[PDB]
Design a protein around this ligand. Structure first.
Ligand SMILES: [Mg+2]
Ligand SMILES: [Mg+2]
Ligand SMILES: [Mg+2]
Ligand SMILES: [Mg+2]
Ligand SMILES: [Mg+2]
Ligand SMILES: [Mg+2]
Ligand SMILES: [Mg+2]
Ligand SMILES: [Mg+2]
Ligand SMILES: [Mg+2]
Ligand SMILES: [Mg+2]
Ligand SMILES: [Mg+2]
Ligand SMILES: [Mg+2]
Ligand SMILES: [Mg+2]
Ligand SMILES: [Mg+2]
Ligand SMILES: [Mg+2]
Ligand SMILES: [Mg+2]
Ligand SMILES: [Mg+2]
Ligand SMILES: [Mg+2]
Lengths: 50, 96, 25, 129, 97, 216, 81, 206, 125, 87
RNA sequence: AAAAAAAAAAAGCUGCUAAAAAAAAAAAA
RNA sequence: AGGGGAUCGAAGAUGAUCAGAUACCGUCGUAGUCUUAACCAUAAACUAUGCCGACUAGGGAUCGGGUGGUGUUUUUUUAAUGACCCACUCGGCACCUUACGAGAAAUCAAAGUCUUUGGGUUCUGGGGGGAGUAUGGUCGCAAGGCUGAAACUUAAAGGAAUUG
């Protein structure tokens, strides 16, 4: 039960803070899901058509 | 069905199989071979007369410990030697 | 004893008895 | 192979009655089966049965009320005389007041009481109670 | 009495199965009876991954893995705790843990 | 006092049920022996044997006593109870209670031609327990009970006047052979006969007729 | 189920059952009335034909045998007779 | 028979189809269920809601035939049916057992929760297998809210339904309470609906 | 170890069950009321009971506790499960008066011979 | 059954199963007796007027009690379209 | 899509017999 | 008896271990292991479950074939095929759940339909040893196989489970 995670910065300086905060990204993620929701409806529409 | 034949014309098989199986009984085999006449010491008789050869002391089987006071005795009618226990308290003094 | 080795001992005894009887005959 | 169609039919009826079903299908439906079923139906142990005609050997659907305890075949079909009838009824009937040993006599297939009344005997077929 | 309906093996409708050898002791055991396990292992043992990554000449090196199928006899599997003795009712549980 | 806590016990104490024929007819589960000896005051009891049974412990063997008890009025009803206890007297008392709870009815009949009262059984019957199978066969008048002493006493306390028995298995297991004879005697009201072929109108239970004099 | 009508089973259940297991057994095969392009020459073909049935006028193979039903050729016209 | 005012009204059909009681189990199907009508694609089967309605009114007739209303016992170990059996208990006599059924409640007369019911109603026979097993020891009729794969052993009246849904269990318990009250006469208007909303018999997350 | 036995635990639960509004979240006052409101033969046992009671009052203040039910708790439970929505979920007002149904549900209701507003949407494998 | 001169003997004529017509024994504790209320012209159930079915422990344990009750109820007319003879 | 694991010096023997449970009645201030 | 004879390896040689250790463990190593021709006829040759036939509970999966579906995918978007999916069916190797039923129990869809005892048929057993021995046949080069007792001895051997 002692397993733990160790994080190390990359030496080159490649590691960097992400451009968007997690919070900022989430609505957009929801929007993709919303597009997917439209697409799931589209899948139903495609099924309905053929 | 069962391992026996059941047909209305299978009486010969039933009878023969019964004879073959009768041989596995102890009493039937003794009576049909005549082992009492052949190999029994008394020859199939209930009683037999004999002559005392000697006196013996037989140790008891477990879990008992005693000397049983038998006699080694040779039968008159066939000459076979057997061992006969002498019963009750002190009857070995009677048997000589 | 183990039955396999009892069978082996019996087979050896049977062979020895055959040899002795062949000496007799 | 199939050696007694009467044995198969009576076994199927027994297993149906034990399971509690009210109907049973029987293949392949001989004349002896029909007569045996007619004796059972006359004494009220089965009910109505129907013969289905294929052109092979026939099938039978038998209706079952709950009254049957056991119907069986006696195999082989033993030769039976007049006193041997009461010996057989003593061996395989539950009581002296009900139950029937069914036997094929020269005057047709009948139960043992009808055989006693006609004073005929024969070969034993089976039983019902 | 009979302990298992499968007789401790997996052979229904064959008769004979070619044997394999225990990886620990080289006992001959039929292939259906053995205690096959699949050792799929990283090549670098999870504590030298950083050292090999910084010593690599290549970026994004895939770091392969080793594949081995281990066959155990009953004695060696029980002694090495690969399987252990279960209770009478739990013996029938076929599912992996 | 009794103060029952069961609908059946309340009805039997109130007197709305006066015979055990209603209980047998409606298959009412009995859980109080005061019901049984209220409705059958004339049944008598007898112990067949006491045997010791032992359980091995870390410090010696723990010995308890197993009592097999038959109870029964000599016309129609019998019961068989088996109890182990630390004391022989307590085993006998609890076995009497259990035997009273197990009372069953007996179908007595005629070997033939039905002149007097039913003297024998109506059909052949068999019970099996363990290896023991006990078969009971109707017998003609004056035969008596052809049985071993224990099953003969059980049949006497049930009220059979004359019967044949056949036993197979290890009959010296007394508890097994007594349970097999109880199963055999119990199956007489299991066998369906042409006189019972006729249809009956399915009566209403006392537990619904007298539901006001029940628990509520 | 303890009560069912064995003498009148439903047509769906009889169609589901095997051909030897229906109330009265019978075939599930049929015959086809088959025309080939060119000559009219209407012919009768078994549904399970086991042989390359040819039109009597010309080498105009009408069916190809299969493990089950015969496989009719591409240019053919059939009616279930 | 019945005076034909007991037929499936269109509003009751709307309630059943909105609560999805017709959506039975998947292609797993117990042979003791002829209640299937026209198996749908995706493997789901459709229950004959007319048959569910007749079985429900037959069950309500049995409950109305029970003399003391507290001799009816409603069982639900399922959270989706706990509130349903509690409201059934509220609206009828019906001593309930919601939650854990302690073993030996129908046997074992010295238990503090020892009941002697004349009829038992359960929500799921598989989840309430202990109660039906105990009823089979002491001669108790059983009504069960079965599905198409429910274990029908020792079940006398099986009301077919969708017992996996939150709304269907509550609707069936609601309808059962409504019809047993109608046959008792507490609801004198057979034609007019009940003032109690069907959402009263529903499970809620908090 | 500091595991408290069932005499302490059962006495604490009974005390809370019949004296919840009287007693507090403070050990000293809980002790001073427990000694006069219960008959406990030992000062030590009284202290242990009052301490476990105070612990359970803290537990009760942080949400409800299983096994403990007092009058205020049960009256709040009944007042909450007598809740009913303003509009039924099973009402057809939601979804515009038409119940979405499949082909099989549609000819089911035609076989039942009932007329009701429905919309058919195809369900594919 | 009775003796030679009227006079019914055999205490306790037993019940028979409504589905399989087998004798319901005294110790058959898996057997039930269903009572269904009768309804008269207004939708109300009359107290004390039932139609009665007896089901044996065997059929209840085999799980045919529901189908058997369906058939018996439809035969007595208090079910309409539940049970089909042609299975 | 996970991480983990390899280990197996030596240890023979213990004389004979001996251990075992059934039924309940007393009436006293 | 020819061939082959890499590995492993009865015997054997050796090093340990050990009170001993011609045992286990280590290293070698003959016969053997493979093959051709001819013998041998045994195995816990086991499902310790003879074969043929009928019937009796639910459940899913799988192998071979067949039928159907405007089903999916691929080809020439689109045909036929093929591979999948769904439904059914015949025939298999099996499995899961129950116990109406069976059983001494363990357990068993047969080991059920058996005192409510009869579908057809073959083989085998009759307490434990002596003993698969002796003897006589017969087969085999041999090893041995098949057939196969008795005298005498003995109150238990044995099965399945329970608690320690
Ligand atoms: Mg013959
Ligand atoms: Mg002795
Ligand atoms: Mg063992
Ligand atoms: Mg083999
Ligand atoms: Mg004997
Ligand atoms: Mg020594
Ligand atoms: Mg030792
Ligand atoms: Mg020694
Ligand atoms: Mg060596
Ligand atoms: Mg052999
Ligand atoms: Mg063998
Ligand atoms: Mg068979
Ligand atoms: Mg297939
Ligand atoms: Mg298959
Ligand atoms: Mg196969
Ligand atoms: Mg013998
Ligand atoms: Mg012997
Ligand atoms: Mg043992």
């Amino acid at each position: 039960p002692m397993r733990s995670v160790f994080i190390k910065k990359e030496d080159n300086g490649a590691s960097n803070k992400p451009v968007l905060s997690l919070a900022e990204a989430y609505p957009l993620y929801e929007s993709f899901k919303q597009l997917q929701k439209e697409r799931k409806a589209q899948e139903f529409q495609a099924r309905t058509t053929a | 069905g069962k391992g026996k034949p059941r047909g209305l014309n299978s009486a010969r098989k039933l009878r023969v199989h019964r004879r073959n199986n009768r041989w596995a009984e102890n009493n039937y085999k003794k009576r049909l071979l005549g082992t009492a006449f052949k190999s029994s010491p008394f020859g199939g008789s209930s009683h037999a007369k004999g002559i005392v050869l000697e006196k013996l002391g037989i140790e008891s089987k477990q879990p008992n410990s005693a000397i049983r006071k038998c006699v080694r005795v040779q039968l008159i009618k066939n000459g076979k030697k057997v061992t006969a226990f002498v019963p009750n308290d002190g009857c070995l003094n009677f048997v000589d | 004893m183990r039955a396999k080795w009892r069978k082996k001992r019996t087979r050896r005894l049977k062979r020895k008895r055959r040899k002795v009887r062949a000496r007799s005959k | 192979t199939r050696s007694s169609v009467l044995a198969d039919a009576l076994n199927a009826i027994n297993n149906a009655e034990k399971t509690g079903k009210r109907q049973v299908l029987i293949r392949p439906s001989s004349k002896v089966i029909i007569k045996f079923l007619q004796v059972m139906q006359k004494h009220g142990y089965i009910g109505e049965f129907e013969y289905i005609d294929d052109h092979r050997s026939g099938k039978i659907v038998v209706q079952l009320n709950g009254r049957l305890n056991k119907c069986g075949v006696i195999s082989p079909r033993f030769n039976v005389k007049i006193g041997d009838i009461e010996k057989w009824t003593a061996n395989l009937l539950p009581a002296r007041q009900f139950g029937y040993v069914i036997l094929t006599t020269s005057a047709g297939i009948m139960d043992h009481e009808e055989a006693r009344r006609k004073h005929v005997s024969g070969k034993i077929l089976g039983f019902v109670y | 009495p009979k302990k298992r309906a499968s007789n401790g093996r997996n052979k229904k409708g064959r008769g004979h199965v070619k044997p394999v050898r225990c990886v620990n002791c080289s006992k001959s055991i039929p292939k259906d009876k053995a205690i096959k396990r699949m050792a799929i292992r990283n090549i670098v043992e999870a504590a030298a991954v950083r050292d090999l990554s910084e010593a690599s000449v290549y970026p994004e090196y895939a770091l392969p893995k080793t594949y081995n199928k281990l066959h155990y006899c009953v004695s060696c599997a029980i002694h090495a705790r690969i399987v252990r003795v279960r209770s009478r009712e739990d013996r029938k549980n076929r599912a992996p843990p | 006092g009794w103060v029952p806590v069961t609908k059946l016990g309340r009805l039997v104490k109130a007197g709305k049920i006066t015979t055990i024929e209603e209980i047998f007819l409606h298959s009412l589960p009995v859980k109080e022996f005061q019901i049984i000896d209220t409705l059958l005051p004339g049944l008598q009891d007898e112990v067949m044997n006491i045997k010791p049974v032992q359980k091995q412990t870390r410090a010696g063997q723990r010995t308890r006593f197993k009592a097999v008890v038959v109870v029964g009025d000599s016309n129609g009803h019998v019961g068989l109870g088996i109890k182990t206890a630390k004391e022989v007297a307590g085993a006998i008392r609890a076995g009497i209670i259990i035997a009273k709870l197990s009372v069953i009815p007996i179908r007595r009949g005629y070997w033939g031609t039905n002149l007097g009262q039913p003297h024998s059984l109506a059909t052949k019957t068999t019970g099996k327990c363990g290896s023991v199978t006990v078969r009971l066969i109707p017998a003609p008048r004056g035969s008596g009970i052809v049985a071993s002493p224990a099953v003969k006493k059980l049949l006497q306390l049930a009220g059979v006047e004359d019967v044949y028995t056949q036993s197979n298995g290890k009959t010296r297991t007394l508890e097994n052979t007594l349970k097999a004879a109880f199963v055999a005697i119990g199956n007489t009201y299991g066998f369906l006969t042409p006189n019972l072929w006729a249809e009956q109108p399915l009566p209403v239970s006392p537990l619904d007729i007298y539901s006001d004099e029940a628990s509520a | 189920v303890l009560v069912q009508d064995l003498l009148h089973p439903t047509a769906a259940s009889e169609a589901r059952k095997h051909k030897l297991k229906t109330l009265v057994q019978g075939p599930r095969s049929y015959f086809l009335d088959v025309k080939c392009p060119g000559c009219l020459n209407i012919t009768t073909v078994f549904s399970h034909a086991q042989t390359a049935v040819t039109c009597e006028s010309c080498s105009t193979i009408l069916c190809t045998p299969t493990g089950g039903k015969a496989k009719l050729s591409e240019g053919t016209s059939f009616r279930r007779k | 028979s019945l005076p034909a005012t007991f037929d499936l009204t269109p509003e009751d059909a709307q309630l059943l189809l909105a609560a999805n009681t017709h959506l039975g189990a998947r292609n797993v199907q117990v042979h003791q269920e002829p209640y299937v009508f026209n198996a749908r694609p995706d493997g789901v089967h459709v229950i004959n809601v007319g048959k569910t309605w007749e079985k429900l009114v037959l069950a309500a007739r049995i409950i109305a035939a029970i003399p003391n209303p507290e001799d009816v016992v409603a069982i639900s170990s399922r959270t989706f049916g706990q509130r349903a059996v509690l409201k059934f208990a509220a609206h009828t006599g019906a001593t309930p057992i919601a939650g854990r059924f302690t073993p030996g409640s129908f046997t074992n007369y010295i238990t503090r929760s020892f009941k002697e019911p004349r009829l038992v109603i359960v929500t799921d026979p598989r989840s309430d297998a202990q109660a039906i097993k105990e009823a089979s020891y002491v001669n108790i009729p059983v009504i069960a809210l079965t599905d198409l794969d429910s274990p029908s052993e020792f079940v006398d009246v099986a009301i077919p339904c969708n017992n996996r849904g939150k709304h269907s269990i509550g609707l069936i318990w609601y309808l059962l309470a409504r019809e047993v009250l109608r046959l008792r006469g507490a609801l004198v208007d057979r034609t007019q609906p009940w003032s109690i909303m069907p959402d009263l018999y529903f499970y809620r997350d908090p | 170890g500091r595991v408290r036995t069932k005499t302490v635990k059962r006495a604490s639960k009974a005390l809370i069950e019949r004296y919840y509004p009287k007693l507090t979240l403070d050990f000293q006052t809980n002790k001073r009321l427990c000694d006069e409101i219960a008959t406990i033969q030992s000062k030590r046992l009284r202290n242990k009971i009052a301490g476990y009671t105070t612990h359970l009052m803290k537990r009760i203040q942080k949400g409800p506790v299983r096994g403990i039910s007092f009058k205020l708790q049960e009256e709040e439970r009944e007042r909450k499960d007598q809740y009913v929505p303003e509009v039924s979920a099973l009402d057809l007002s939601r979804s515009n008066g038409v119940l979405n149904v499949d082909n099989q549900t549609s000819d089911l209701v035609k076989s039942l011979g009932l007329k009701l507003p429905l919309s058919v949407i195809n369900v594919s494998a | 059954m009775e003796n030679d001169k009227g006079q019914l003997v055999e205490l306790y004529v037993p019940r028979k199963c409504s589905a399989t017509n087998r004798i319901i024994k005294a110790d058959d504790h898996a057997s039930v007796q269903i009572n269904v209320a009768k309804v008269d012209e207004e939708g109300r159930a009359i107290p004390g007027e039932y139609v009665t079915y007896a089901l044996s422990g065997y059929v209840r344990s085999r799980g045919e009690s529901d189908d058997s009750l369906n058939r018996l109820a439809q035969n007595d007319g208090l079910l309409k379209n539940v049970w089909s003879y042609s299975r």
